[PDB]
Design an enzyme around this catalytic site. Structure first.
Site, mmCIF file in Angstrom:
data_model
loop_
_atom_site.group_PDB
_atom_site.id
_atom_site.type_symbol
_atom_site.label_atom_id
_atom_site.label_comp_id
_atom_site.label_asym_id
_atom_site.label_seq_id
_atom_site.Cartn_x
_atom_site.Cartn_y
_atom_site.Cartn_z
ATOM 1 N N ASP A 13 106.035 86.884 69.494
ATOM 2 C CA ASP A 13 105.504 88.156 69.964
ATOM 3 C C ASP A 13 103.994 88.076 70.142
ATOM 4 O O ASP A 13 103.288 87.590 69.252
ATOM 5 C CB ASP A 13 105.883 89.261 68.966
ATOM 6 C CG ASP A 13 105.408 90.634 69.396
ATOM 7 O OD1 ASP A 13 105.633 91.000 70.570
ATOM 8 O OD2 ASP A 13 104.844 91.356 68.549
ATOM 9 N N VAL B 223 104.292 96.091 78.670
ATOM 10 C CA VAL B 223 102.861 95.984 78.414
ATOM 11 C C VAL B 223 102.268 97.367 78.642
ATOM 12 O O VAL B 223 102.161 97.817 79.788
ATOM 13 C CB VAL B 223 102.184 94.940 79.313
ATOM 14 C CG1 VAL B 223 100.678 94.956 79.097
ATOM 15 C CG2 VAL B 223 102.749 93.551 79.030
ATOM 16 N N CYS C 225 100.012 102.343 71.686
ATOM 17 C CA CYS C 225 99.168 101.444 72.463
ATOM 18 C C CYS C 225 98.088 102.207 73.213
ATOM 19 O O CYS C 225 98.316 103.314 73.707
ATOM 20 C CB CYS C 225 99.984 100.630 73.471
ATOM 21 S SG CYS C 225 99.474 98.893 73.535
ATOM 22 N N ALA D 289 100.689 90.258 72.779
ATOM 23 C CA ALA D 289 100.423 91.258 73.812
ATOM 24 C C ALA D 289 100.543 90.656 75.207
ATOM 25 O O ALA D 289 101.303 91.148 76.048
ATOM 26 C CB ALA D 289 99.037 91.878 73.618
#
Ligand SMILES: NC(=O)c1ccc[n+]([C@@H]2O[C@H](COP(=O)([O-])OP(=O)(O)OC[C@H]3O[C@@H](n4cnc5c(N)ncnc54)[C@H](OP(=O)(O)O)[C@@H]3O)[C@@H](O)[C@H]2O)c1
Ligand SMILES: NC(=O)c1ccc[n+]([C@@H]2O[C@H](COP(=O)([O-])OP(=O)(O)OC[C@H]3O[C@@H](n4cnc5c(N)ncnc54)[C@H](OP(=O)(O)O)[C@@H]3O)[C@@H](O)[C@H]2O)c1
Ligand SMILES: *c1nc2c(ncn2[C@@H]2O[C@H](COP(=O)(O)O)[C@@H](O)[C@H]2O)c(=O)[nH]1
Ligand SMILES: *c1nc2c(ncn2[C@@H]2O[C@H](COP(=O)(O)O)[C@@H](O)[C@H]2O)c(=O)[nH]1
Ligand SMILES: *c1nc2c(ncn2[C@@H]2O[C@H](COP(=O)(O)O)[C@@H](O)[C@H]2O)c(=O)[nH]1
Ligand SMILES: O=c1[nH]cnc2c1ncn2[C@@H]1O[C@H](COP(=O)(O)O)[C@@H](O)[C@H]1O
Ligand SMILES: O=c1[nH]cnc2c1ncn2[C@@H]1O[C@H](COP(=O)(O)O)[C@@H](O)[C@H]1O
Ligand SMILES: O=c1[nH]cnc2c1ncn2[C@@H]1O[C@H](COP(=O)(O)O)[C@@H](O)[C@H]1O
Ligand SMILES: O=c1[nH]cnc2c1ncn2[C@@H]1O[C@H](COP(=O)(O)O)[C@@H](O)[C@H]1O
Lengths: 473, 473, 473, 99
Positions: B245, B296, B302, B247
């Protein structure tokens, strides 16, 4: 610029309407990205501070230029005030910052208010140019306003010679009660200060400097009066860049103003705006400008859209104008509407070489305005447009009451606005950290190691309002 | 996926932008739908719990896996803690749940707070492994906080041997004062508890189990350090699935991490993310991943979109990535942005094999955080991103103060958020009922008896924001 | 339907997304428009009341049918209660309305509460079937709750024989203290009441009546159980129209239910829904339905969209389904999402023969629920969906606790909603005035004298959210 | 408080506060048949009949019974109201634990 397949909307786009899709990347760290610009401005980060009297002062000019940006002094500034500001900026040290200084005979009332003109959290008590103490906000808490600084100043503080490694100064201040190192000259006189965060930023940001190693600074000029004589006086005052600025940059008077300045051959980069069309971008460059300022309407203080219907979604305006300037070897500044770091990243992805920020930086310690507090004790500062009734009043105070009344018909800007300071990170350098960290992350997401590669490699998409809502604000 | 005629918009789509058109259906009941996944994860419902420290704990891992999901342990977890959590989950019973246990010497203060770590509404008093009483919240109302548990424990309670049919246990508790049946081992020691609702869920949900018949659990690993050595330690600890994992999953470091884990030949499904492009999906699968995590930006914690402008509307990203993974025989997990059951249903309709959910499950009894109350006495729990200032501080606490200062430049997550618990149905199993009941109805609306038929038969349409507003929230 | 040139959007449209452009008209007055329907329902206005237990009661059925609409009794109603409601409705007068009646022995407490079950503002005191007084809300103001009606009733009131011209009754009440004329039979027994507004409406609305001149009423039936036997019992009880209703109308169990009812040859219009696709419309008609009920999701009490993502913007759904039905000689009812008269007008412009309205009519005096008041003394009534936890609890109350617990997994409707009454016009006939006045104006804007000409002559356009915002809310 | 099975819930709810017993006695032919409490009328349609919400089970005792025993009969009763009856079965009244 490349858009995803089928993303050809029947309308123009703002920063909110678009997104960047990541690509294959080999940039291992976001610190590997080079943020330097290529438009001749000399900035090492893509940040320019707008020529607005509520933002562009000497403290802002020093602070931003040390971190790689540049400040454009407003056109309403008298030439003597311009010369004094330029001489102050160009005598600043490249690593050590200018602190608030206090005489021991100053009142605690003055010491409390002067503290917030910088972000250091402390002022240096000076006597005959030499540091003798520190004053923080805690030292002014509960004391009568008319006691003297000498009664509250801390007498012991960390000192280090100017030129010391900033990494060492960082370690000297690890267990110090005050996060300030008073930097001294060989004779003991005050040279400035350096905090722990200031030392970290010394190894992250490169100062924007002229050919003599002094901090860079720019100046703006209007299109009325003797533009050539005003531009030459700004050049002789030491400005490193000239901005010929007006609301409707695509008029004949602007074209004549550009020629008058270019024919003088000052050897400086010439910025002219504002336009939002490809035709206007070509006409200003052909007149002698090397950089075109793009934006009609998007400024946070502007009412042009509601007054006239004239404007253009800023992303589409930058895309079209940057492509037109690129054909002629010119560059484009994206001016207005910057609220979050994504607006900076998206403008650079659209083809702009620099991004001009105005109202956002008014809510900082370094901006010229006084720090205010609301009923909830939230810190804020005022901002206002350069075409508002307040700005026009100060700019035309020398005219007759008849002409000032007739001119009062026009107002395309707000005369007062409340720009709040972040209760934790209230300095302009904190916002620069916020902006540049986002732009650095955009580059590694697209696989770019510098700003030219960003515009070259970026792939963009169009979204609905629901798309922009995805994520957390 | 099929869209209605002419629904080809010039932009990318979120879950809010689309809808499902019903088709001809012969599925008689929504209980006839098979919700099992075919991606090798072993889940019998298409729910995966995100590898976030605010969600993925051992109580979450046991509870979700018994109902057919799987929990990914965060990458910040020490290997010793991972082994202790895996051994706990893999020693749980497949039908009977683990209750909060109390010693009679525990304080009423401790008993009151411990109750909300499970959704049973009752804790079991235990002496030498054997149940001797029950404690409910009604028993702690008014008693001194430092009175002992034995002073308020209910001495009589319903008991049954482990292995009893859940339908009979359902009938045993119809008129019992407390809806908890204490399940016992042949020697009388405590084996666990089973409520009326828990007995109903035993006939609706199939547990996710490994080859030994023990509940499944997964583990996440970062791309920095020795990814191979870490992945192998997680495999030997008993992890049934590995998640690599980061980003920006489309960088060279991720591709090398996948190859390092794939060449070790652990025999486990290999998940890698995150990307939002078809090219990114192919590169991850070719490097050795069998499942690609997609998303994303859309995560509720986020700030990547606002910091960088990088991201893709999650529905269009899942559609493109799932088709690219399908071409190579791989699968795609839809990660982030799930707010309502329709989001889970539309992600599966877009082609994802599993849906990863994070912040939504933080507001449950079983999440690791402590239960808090606002000024209005509303229950809530904290949630935060794995790339925020709070999470990065705990992950990099052993580094020098200079490096932690430099790394403080980047922050793409919120450090605190209030996720409210439904005052009635505050357990994670209540949300699984909510989510799976919606997915089952979607499958019968389209005429699908399973998840492959859902993606195969679904017809979609595009709508404006007015279309999304039709109906009640 | 005709759309303006180029108005072919890449998405489906709700009522908010569209507008009607007027054309050349010779219709001199909006009272010249014929609002009668052609689908065999017998309605003289295009309004059908939804088969929802919070809306469809006997008081609603009488009031709407007298003004030209029709009420569909809910499918949960026992056949005994259906027979009683039908016999009450079919014994009503075509002009004179049924008042709230009171015995002199009734308490003032009951009188003040019963008063709001009609919109007359007065109850008739009755003894042995003959009127002896009137009671208004002002007569109960301040009186002890358990005083008797005879203590507060007005002794003199306007009386007139049944069959009197409503034009004259309007004149009799010009100067009367209470706006109600008590209509009497030749023997002096109470025949009902008639107000000034009620006499006006008799010359504007044509009652919907069966072949024997009695008010029309419809009934709904589900697709579970013995659909044929349930439909036949409803036919023998006097239903004028049958509605076979379920959420997912495009399934095999519905197609069999239609064929089972059609094979019995009851001689009544047979309605079946719900679908939102042309294929579903053709399949229901070929199975034996003459009218297809269109709408999946738009209901104000529905959570289907949020649970499943299944649905379709109602305007586009009606356009497609009405076109498919007209090719087969069938008709379409627009069911769900009606908030304003424009929604009714646009559904008819889209091609629907009738418009079904549910929760909007719950906030009236005539709806079956009790009248409630908030803390601000605002009048409101409860509304709820027929698939909520409250509705399925009464529908499945006779099942075992095990089955009701399993079926508790599914919930696609809200169980409580506050529908406010207009403090001035709280009767359903006021809403009928509001709706039909809008539809009549729509027809004269288009140039249509009847509903078939409306669909034939209408030209439509598409707008953005800014377009819908033009005008006053 | 006495109620007929034909009385409305609206009347029943308002009549309960004319006594401190917290419950009303449903009576048919002078005989106690059911009890009505405020909890029985919570949520019910105001114009439903009393016969729909009456509790058919209640503690009963003949009139003249010792109060101490009646007090003990109600210790575990759900309703703290004991219905006292005459020798012919008709209602004589009520007696609570505090009464
Ligand atoms: N799915 C998303 O959209 C998303 C977004 C943010 C965070 N996260 C979560 O954050 C956790 C991991 O933290 P992390 O994302 O910071 O990854 P990480 O695995 O902790 O570190 C990422 C590594 O890649 C480098 N990198 C290069 N470009 C980057 C970029 N644009 N963004 C981030 N790192 C970049 C970083 O170096 P430098 O730091 O020196 O540049 C660092 O060495 C995971 O749980 C992940 O799910 C997810
Ligand atoms: N128009 C709409 O959008 C809408 C939406 C919801 C409810 N309703 C209202 O609800 C009432 C009827 O309740 P109902 O719709 O639940 O029908 P119902 O007649 O009570 O039952 C529907 C039957 O079909 C089965 N079914 C299969 N797929 C289904 C699905 N996707 N949704 C629901 N049932 C499904 C059910 O079995 P299982 O239950 O075992 O699956 C059940 O046997 C009507 O008044 C209707 O107007 C309307
Ligand atoms: C409209 N625009 C105005 C005015 N004064 C300055 N400006 C423009 O706005 C830019 C700054 O935008 P922000 O959004 O504040 O960053 C300036 O650079 C200038 O172009 C005014 O009165 N009306
Ligand atoms: C951005 N995204 C982040 C961060 N930590 C985790 N995540 C991502 O969000 C997903 C959860 O989304 P929800 O909307 O909460 O369900 C995670 O699975 C991960 O992909 C962060 O700091 N910033
Ligand atoms: C969803 N839809 C439901 C439910 N009960 C009824 N309905 C539908 O809504 C229509 C009424 O719409 P309004 O907007 O209230 O006029 C009904 O006719 C029916 O089609 C339910 O529980 N969920
Ligand atoms: O460090 C300081 N010490 C004392 N006065 C200061 C200092 N900085 C600013 N001032 C005063 O504040 C005025 C405005 O400063 P400015 O806001 O930086 O332009 C100056 O002209 C000085 O009078
Ligand atoms: O059933 C229980 N009885 C007593 N203490 C418990 C119980 N469950 C959790 N705890 C305590 O709460 C801590 C945190 O548990 P967690 O939230 O499940 O990780 C444990 O380490 C124990 O100290
Ligand atoms: O005019 C009236 N007089 C007296 N009672 C009425 C009247 N209308 C309704 N009710 C009562 O209210 C109940 C419910 O009526 P509904 O709301 O019309 O179904 C009836 O069963 C009666 O008990
Ligand atoms: O137990 C009761 N059952 C029925 N009605 C009652 C009862 N008690 C009082 N009422 C009614 O309430 C009125 C006033 O009673 P008071 O307040 O006791 O004078 C009586 O005249 C009756 O109409």
């Amino acid at each position: 610029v490349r858009f995803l397949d089928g993303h050809t909307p029947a309308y123009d786009l703002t920063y909110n309407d678009v997104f960047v899709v990541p690509g294959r990347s080999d940039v291992a760290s976001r610190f590997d990205v080079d943020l330097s610009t290529v438009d001749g401005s000399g900035t090492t980060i893509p940040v320019v501070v707008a020529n607005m009297t509520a933002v562009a002062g000497r403290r802002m000019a020093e602070t931003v230029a040390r971190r790689g940006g540049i400040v454009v002094l407003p056109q309403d500034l008298p030439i003597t005030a311009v010369s004094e500001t330029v001489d102050f900026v160009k005598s600043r040290d490249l690593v050590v910052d200018t602190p608030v200084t206090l005489s021991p005979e100053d009142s605690v009332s003055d010491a409390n208010a002067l503290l917030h003109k910088r972000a250091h959290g402390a002022a240096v008590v000076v006597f005959e140019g030499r540091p003798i103490g520190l004053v923080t906000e805690a030292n002014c808490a509960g004391v009568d306003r008319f006691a003297r600084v000498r009664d509250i100043a801390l007498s012991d503080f960390v000192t280090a010679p100017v030129g010391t490694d900033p990494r060492e100064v960082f370690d000297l201040l690890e267990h110090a009660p005050i996060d300030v190192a008073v930097m001294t000259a060989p004779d003991g006189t005050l040279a400035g200060v350096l905090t722990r965060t200031g030392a970290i930023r010394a190894g992250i940001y490169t100062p924007a400097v002229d050919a003599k190693g002094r901090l860079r600074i720019a100046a703006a000029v209007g299109i009325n009066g003797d533009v050539g004589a005003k531009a030459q006086a700004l050049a002789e005052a030491g400005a490193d860049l000239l901005v010929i600025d007006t609301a409707h940059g695509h008029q004949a008077k602007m074209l004549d103003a550009i020629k008058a300045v270019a024919s003088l051959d000052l050897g400086l980069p010439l910025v002219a705006g504002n336009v939002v069309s490809a035709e206007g971008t070509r006409d200003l460059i052909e007149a002698g400008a090397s950089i075109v300022k793009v934006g009609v309407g998007p400024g946070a203080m502007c009412t042009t859209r509601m007054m006239t219907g004239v404007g253009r979604p800023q992303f589409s305006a930058v895309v079209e104008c940057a492509a037109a300037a690129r054909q002629l070897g010119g560059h484009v500044w994206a001016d207005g509407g910057v609220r979050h770091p994504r607006d900076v990243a998206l403008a650079l992805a659209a083809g702009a070489s620099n991004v001009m920020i105005g109202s956002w930086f008014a809510g900082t310690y370094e901006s010229p305005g006084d720090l205010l507090f609301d009923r909830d004790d939230r810190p804020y500062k005022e901002s206002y447009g350069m075409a508002s009734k307040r700005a026009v009043a100060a700019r035309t105070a020398g005219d007759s009451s008849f002409d000032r009344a007739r001119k009062g018909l026009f107002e395309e800007g707000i005369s007062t606005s409340r720009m709040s300071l972040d209760p934790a990170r209230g300095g302009v350098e904190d916002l620069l950290d916020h902006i540049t960290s986002g732009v650095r992350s955009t580059c590694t997401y697209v696989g770019a190691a510098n700003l030219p590669e960003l515009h070259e490699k970026v792939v963009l998409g169009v979204q609905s309002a629901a798309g922009f809502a995805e994520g957390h604000p």
